[PDB]
Design a protein around this ligand. Structure first.
Ligand SMILES: c1nc(N2CCC3(CCCNC3)CC2)c2nc[nH]c2n1
Lengths: 18, 344
């Protein structure tokens, strides 16, 4: 599922600005 | 289309602009000193430095104090952005914008003392719960819509909308806390700034852009609140940018017809078609079907019962925030970067 792909990604934590 | 309601909004905004300009042209400066506050605990960090819960001894009030190291701001080429942040925050006044109470500087650092918002970041609640129901996301979204209507009327562009930069107050309402990329600009601007997931295509493509980038970012926020994940995600920023520019978006099957329609108009690559950027401005958003149940005045007046009230143990409680590594403040005996931050 898209949710499972999101949860397994390295971008579920706080995201830094560019 | 045009009504008495829109006329009352116009009148309110004209007076809000009069108030803003007085403060914008004559900024408050050096209104406290570091020794007037007891430093308790770190609430959050950034490349900017850290934000700590503090107690003002004279009143016993708790505040959130942002500490920026002047040398780090210079190395990161964020001098102008830091001067913008404080000049703007001291001049604004809206129910969903955190108040700046005091600001000052010493040999080493810059300091911004703001009201403490005890409910924690929307990011924390969103990730823990998974996603917000459509009425829950709508309640927060309505506050951002009003906040952007106010900010944009002052020629301000926000540029850092995300759950990590939205805090929940004791009444369950939103407090926008992060003005690091806010800028007062009448034409177009070009700075590559913001967060990968939230960037409008025109920012990625190095075009001159305007306040329409904030309306695209609202589309990203609404999607993330309602889905539990962003519309464009990947392990690396380059893969996120490829998805943003592609012109393709996919919605969860549980999204209502009205929600998808609103998001297709906000997450619109074509600027002649993006909601918030048309002849009708913010009214294309406020009058959209997804917002039919929203009473804009009741939201502004904070008369609407919030869908979620954060847990409050008492004053000074930080249970709604993650724990961070603490480091003692060191004030140099020599003034650093004095000329660069003279107006702070
Ligand atoms: C509580 N915490 C704050 N923090 C600063 C912003 C932050 C940290 C930096 C990224 N955005 C969220 C969370 C903590 C506040 N900033 C102003 N008032 C606040 N109340």
């Amino acid at each position: 599922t898209t949710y499972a792909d999101f949860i397994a990604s390295g971008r579920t934590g706080r995201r830094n600005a560019i | 289309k045009k009504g008495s309601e829109q006329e009352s909004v116009k009148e309110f905004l004209a007076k809000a602009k009069e108030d803003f300009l007085k403060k914008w042209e004559n900024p408050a400066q050096n209104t406290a000193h570091l020794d007037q506050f007891e430093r308790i605990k770190t609430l959050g960090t950034g490349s900017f430095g850290r934000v700590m819960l503090v107690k003002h001894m004279e009143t016993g009030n708790h505040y959130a104090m942002k500490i920026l190291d002047k040398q780090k701001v210079v190395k990161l080429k964020q001098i102008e952005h830091t001067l913008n942040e404080k000049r703007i925050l001291q001049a604004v006044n809206f129910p969903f914008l955190v108040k700046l109470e005091f600001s000052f500087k010493d040999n080493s650092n810059l300091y911004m003392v703001m009201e403490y918002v005890p409910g924690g970041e929307m990011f924390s609640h969103l990730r823990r719960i998974g996603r917000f129901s459509e009425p829950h996301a709508r309640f927060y979204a309505a506050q951002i819509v009003l906040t952007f209507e106010y900010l944009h009327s002052l020629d301000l562009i926000y540029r850092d909308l995300k759950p990590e930069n939205l805090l929940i107050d004791q009444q369950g309402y939103i407090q926008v806390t992060d003005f690091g990329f806010a800028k007062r600009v009448k034409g177009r601007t070009w700075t590559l700034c913001g967060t990968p997931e939230y960037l409008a295509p025109e920012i990625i493509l190095s075009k001159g852009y305007n306040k329409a980038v904030d309306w695209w970012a609202l589309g990203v926020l609404i999607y993330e609140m309602a889905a539990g994940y962003p519309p464009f995600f990947a392990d690396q920023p380059i893969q996120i940018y490829e998805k943003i520019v592609s012109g393709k978006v996919r919605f969860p099957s549980h999204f209502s017809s009205d929600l998808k329609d609103l998001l297709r108009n906000l997450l619109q690559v074509d600027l002649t078609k993006r909601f918030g950027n048309l002849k009708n401005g913010v009214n294309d958003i406020k009058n959209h079907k997804w917002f039919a149940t929203t009473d804009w005045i009741a939201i502004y007046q904070r008369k609407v019962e919030a869908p979620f009230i954060p847990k409050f143990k008492g004053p000074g409680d930080t249970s709604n925030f993650d724990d961070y590594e603490e480091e003692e403040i060191r004030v140099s005996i020599n003034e650093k970067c004095g000329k660069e931050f003279s107006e702070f």
